[PDB]
C-alpha cells in the first residue's frame, strides 16, 4: 500500500506519469505526478507551473487540499505535503526555467513542515544547487500565508501584494505561486513567479516545478 513516488520506483516502474499515492492516517488517495528521470528518479511533484492555465490566487482551504490537475499545472496540498513529510525525512529540489530556455535548480537536504495549528511552517536545511549561491527561500522559516492569512513575519499583508500563497518573511526572496507572466511581460513584474538569486526579483519565470523524494535513495 504505497505512499509516494520513490515507492513507485522501488516497485520497478521507471516511467514518468500520473500515479495514485495513499497517505498514512489519510483515508483516501490523491493522484500525483511522479518524476522518474531526474538525478535518479523517484521524485514526487508538489507543484507544477508551465503555462498559467491554473490560477494560484486562492485561499487556505484551497491551498490546504491542493488543486489543479497532476497532468498539467498543479499544487499537491499542504495537509498532504505535511502528511507526507511526517512519515519520514525528505529532501527538496526545485526545477526552474526562464524564457531564454535556461534550466536551474535549488536543492535542499532536510525538508519538513509543521501542521495546521503551526501554519505549515517552513523547516529547510542544506541549500545546494545552481539557483544562486544563497537560498531564495527562507530556511529558518516563518509561517505559510494566503490571501486570508496574514501569517508573514511582516507587518503589511504579504499575501495581497505578491499574490497567492507562499512562505512570506517580510516578503521573502521567492514566490513560485504568484502571478504567471507570459513572454515579454516577464520582464519587470513584481508579484510574478520569482526566485532572487537566480534570475532577479522582477522576473516572472517560465516553468517551475517543486519536488521531493526521501533522503535514502
Amino acid at each position: 500500500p504505497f505512499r509516494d513516488c520513490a515507492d513507485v520506483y522501488q516497485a520497478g516502474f521507471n516511467k514518468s506519469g500520473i500515479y495514485t499515492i495513499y497517505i498514512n492516517n489519510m483515508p483516501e488517495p490523491k493522484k500525483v505526478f511522479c518524476n522518474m528521470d531526474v538525478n535518479g528518479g523517484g521524485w514526487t511533484v508538489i507543484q507544477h507551473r508551465e503555462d498559467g492555465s491554473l490560477d494560484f490566487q486562492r485561499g487556505w482551504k484551497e491551498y490546504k487540499m491542493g488543486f489543479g490537475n497532476p497532468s498539467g499545472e498543479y499544487w499537491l496540498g499542504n495537509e498532504f505535503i505535511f502528511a507526507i513529510t511526517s512519515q519520514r525525512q525528505y529532501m527538496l529540489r526545485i526545477e526552474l526555467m526562464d524564457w531564454e530556455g535556461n534550466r536551474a535548480y535549488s536543492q535542499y537536504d532536510r525538508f519538513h513542515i509543521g501542521n495546521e495549528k503551526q501554519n505549515y511552517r517552513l523547516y529547510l536545511k542544506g541549500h545546494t544547487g545552481t539557483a544562486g549561491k544563497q537560498s531564495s527561500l527562507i530556511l529558518h522559516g516563518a509561517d505559510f500565508s494566503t490571501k486570508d492569512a496574514d501569517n508573514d513575519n511582516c507587518m503589511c499583508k504579504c499575501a495581497l501584494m505578491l499574490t497567492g500563497g507562499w512562505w512570506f518573511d517580510a516578503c521573502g526572496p521567492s514566490n513560485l505561486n504568484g502571478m504567471f507572466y507570459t513572454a515579454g511581460q516577464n520582464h519587470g513584474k513584481l508579484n510574478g513567479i520569482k526566485w532572487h538569486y537566480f534570475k532577479g526579483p522582477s522576473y516572472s519565470l517560465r516553468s517551475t516545478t517543486m519536488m521531493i523524494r526521501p533522503l535514502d535513495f
Binding site: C154, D169, A170, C171, L190
Partner: protein, 514 residues
C-alpha cells in the same frame, strides 16, 4: 522667447511650510503659468486641486504655498508650463517626507545615452522589512530584509533614452507616498553630441552647463550665462540673463532651483547638499560645489564664481591674457516704433568685445518666434544685424526684443511696435464742373479707410487707353485744364502716411467727357 524658472523652497517637507514659485521673465502680457501635480512621472498620486496664488516679490510669478502642518498630500512630483509660439516648456521637481525612510542624495541626474549610472539613496530610518525601488510608479525590484545595504544602489549600464523618469524608494509595507524621490534625465545623444540624429556637436558649455540635444545650445547653471556658460554672473543673481535676485539675506542658502528639461535641478552656485544648506568646501565653486578650482598661478577661489584673476588675466582658470572680455550691450534701440504695414527690415545693433557674429544675434516676434539675420553688416565696434518680414501687419503690434548671446554674456532689450494701417480714401471724388477743355473735382479723402496722419494727397487720372496721372495736391477741390475734347476720363484719390510704406491704394473714381 521665454525665461522659465522653477523655485523649490526646499523639496524636503517637515512640519513647517514649503513653497513652489514659478517665475517667468516676459512682458506684455504674461502667458498663464500652470502649476499642477505631475501625475504622469509618478502615478497613483492623490488628487487635490492645488491653489495657484500669485507672487509679488517679482514681476510675474505664481506660487503654491502649503501652510505649516497642512503639508499632507504634497508627496509627489510637480511641474510648471510657460510655453511660447505653439511650443511648450516644463520643469519637473518633487516633494517628499523629510523623514520618509530614505534620501535620494540628489533630486536630478543629467546623463547621456550609454553611460553607467548608480542611482542611490542613503538609508535613514532602518525597519525590519525589505527595501523597494519604483520608477514611473511601476514596480521593478527590491532587497531582502536582512541584507539591506547602507547606500541603496541601482546600477543601469548603457542607459537608453526610454529608460528615465522619477525613481522611488520605500520600506515595502508602505505608502506610494512615504517614499523618497530622485529624477533621472537621459538625453537622446552622447555628451557633446546633439541634433535630430546625433550628427552635430554642442557649443561646449563650461561650468557644468548642459548641452541641449535639440538646439546644441547650453542651459546654464544659475549665476552663469553665455552660450558656453562661462560668464561670472553678479553676486546673488540668476537666470538666462541674470536679471533676477535671491530674496534671502544670505543669498540662496535654501532655494533649490529647477531648469528646462535637459538640465534637471540644482542649488545656486555656492551651495552643497540636498537642501543647499551646506557651504562649499574650499577649492570648489560651482552648482552643488561640483567644480574644482584649477587656478594656474594661485588666484583666490570663490564658492560663488570661480577664479578671481589678477588684473589683465581672464579665463576659466586664469589661463589666458588679453583684453578683459566685455559682455554685449544693445545700442541705439529706442523705446517706441510705429511702422506701416508691409515688407520690413528691422535692425539690431550690439556693442561688446566678444563682438557679436550673426550666429549670436536674434529677434523675437511678440508671439515668441526666433528670427535670424538675413544679412550682416559690421563695423569697428558694434556688429549690426538685419532681418526681414514678408508683410508685417497690425496684429504684430506689441513688444519685440533684440537677443544678443555671445560667449561672455547674454543681453536682451525691447521695443513696443505699433503697426499702423495705410489710409485709402472712403468715397469717390465728386465732380464740380465740366467743359470742352477742363474739369473741376471734390477730392473726397476726409473719410479714409485706415488711420495715421495724412501727409500728401496725389491725384490720379487716365483715359481708357493707358496710364499717367499726378499732381501733389494743396486744396481739397481741384482743376485740371489742358484737357482733350471728348474723351472718357477716370479719376482716383490716393492718400499718404508716415515714412516707409505710406503709399496705400486708391479706390474711389467717377468718369466724364465734354
Amino acid at each position: 522667447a521665454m525665461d522659465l524658472i522653477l523655485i523649490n523652497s526646499l523639496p524636503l517637507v517637515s512640519d513647517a511650510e514649503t513653497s513652489l514659485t514659478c517665475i517667468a521673465s516676459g512682458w506684455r502680457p504674461h502667458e498663464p503659468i500652470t502649476i499642477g501635480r505631475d501625475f504622469e512621472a509618478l502615478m497613483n498620486q492623490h488628487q487635490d486641486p492645488l491653489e495657484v496664488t500669485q507672487d509679488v516679490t517679482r514681476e510675474w510669478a505664481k506660487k503654491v504655498v502649503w501652510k505649516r502642518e497642512k503639508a499632507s498630500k504634497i508627496n509627489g512630483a510637480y511641474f510648471c508650463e510657460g510655453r511660447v509660439r505653439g511650443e511648450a516648456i516644463r520643469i519637473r521637481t518633487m516633494k517628499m517626507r523629510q523623514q520618509a525612510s530614505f534620501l535620494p542624495a540628489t533630486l536630478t541626474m543629467t546623463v547621456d545615452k550609454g553611460d553607467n549610472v548608480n542611482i542611490s539613496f542613503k538609508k535613514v530610518l532602518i525597519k525590519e522589512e525589505d527595501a523597494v525601488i519604483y520608477k514611473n510608479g511601476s514596480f521593478i525590484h527590491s532587497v531582502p530584509r536582512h541584507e539591506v545595504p547602507d547606500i541603496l544602489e541601482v546600477h543601469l549600464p548603457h542607459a537608453q533614452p526610454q529608460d528615465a523618469g522619477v525613481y522611488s524608494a520605500r520600506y515595502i509595507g508602505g505608502n506610494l507616498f512615504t517614499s523618497a524621490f530622485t529624477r533621472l534625465i537621459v538625453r537622446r545623444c552622447e555628451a557633446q553630441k546633439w541634433g535630430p540624429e546625433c550628427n552635430h556637436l554642442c557649443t561646449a558649455c563650461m561650468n557644468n552647463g548642459v548641452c541641449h540635444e535639440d538646439t546644441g545650445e547650453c542651459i546654464c547653471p544659475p549665476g552663469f550665462m553665455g552660450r558656453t556658460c562661462e560668464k561670472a554672473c553678479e553676486l546673488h543673481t540668476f537666470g538666462r540673463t541674470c536679471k533676477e535676485r535671491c530674496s534671502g539675506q544670505e543669498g540662496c542658502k535654501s532655494y533649490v532651483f529647477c531648469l528646462p528639461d535637459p538640465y534637471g535641478c540644482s542649488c545656486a552656485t555656492g551651495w552643497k547638499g540636498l537642501q543647499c544648506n551646506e557651504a562649499c568646501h574650499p577649492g570648489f565653486y560651482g552648482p552643488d560645489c561640483k567644480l574644482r578650482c584649477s587656478c594656474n598661478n594661485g588666484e583666490m577661489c570663490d564658492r560663488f564664481q570661480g577664479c578671481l584673476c589678477s588684473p589683465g588675466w581672464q579665463g576659466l582658470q586664469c589661463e589666458r591674457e588679453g583684453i578683459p572680455r566685455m559682455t554685449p550691450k544693445i545700442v541705439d534701440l529706442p523705446d517706441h516704433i510705429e511702422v506701416n504695414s508691409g515688407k520690413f527690415n528691422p535692425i539690431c545693433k550690439a556693442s561688446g568685445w566678444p563682438l557679436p557674429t550673426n550666429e549670436e544675434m536674434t529677434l523675437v516676434k511678440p508671439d515668441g518666434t526666433v528670427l535670424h539675420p538675413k544679412d550682416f553688416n559690421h563695423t569697428d565696434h558694434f556688429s549690426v544685424a538685419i532681418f526681414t518680414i514678408h508683410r508685417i501687419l497690425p496684429p504684430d503690434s506689441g513688444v519685440w526684443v533684440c537677443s544678443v548671446n555671445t560667449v561672455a554674456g547674454m543681453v536682451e532689450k525691447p521695443f513696443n511696435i505699433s503697426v499702423k494701417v495705410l489710409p485709402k480714401p472712403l468715397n469717390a471724388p465728386n465732380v464740380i464742373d465740366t467743359g470742352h477743355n477742363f474739369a473741376v473735382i471734390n477730392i473726397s479723402s476726409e473719410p479714409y479707410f485706415g488711420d495715421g496722419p495724412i501727409k500728401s494727397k496725389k491725384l490720379l487720372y487716365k483715359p481708357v487707353n493707358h496710364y499717367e496721372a499726378w499732381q501733389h495736391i494743396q486744396v481739397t477741390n481741384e482743376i485740371v485744364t489742358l484737357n482733350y475734347l471728348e474723351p472718357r476720363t477716370e479719376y482716383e484719390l490716393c492718400v499718404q502716411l508716415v515714412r516707409r510704406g505710406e503709399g496705400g491704394e486708391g479706390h474711389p473714381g467717377p468718369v466724364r467727357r465734354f
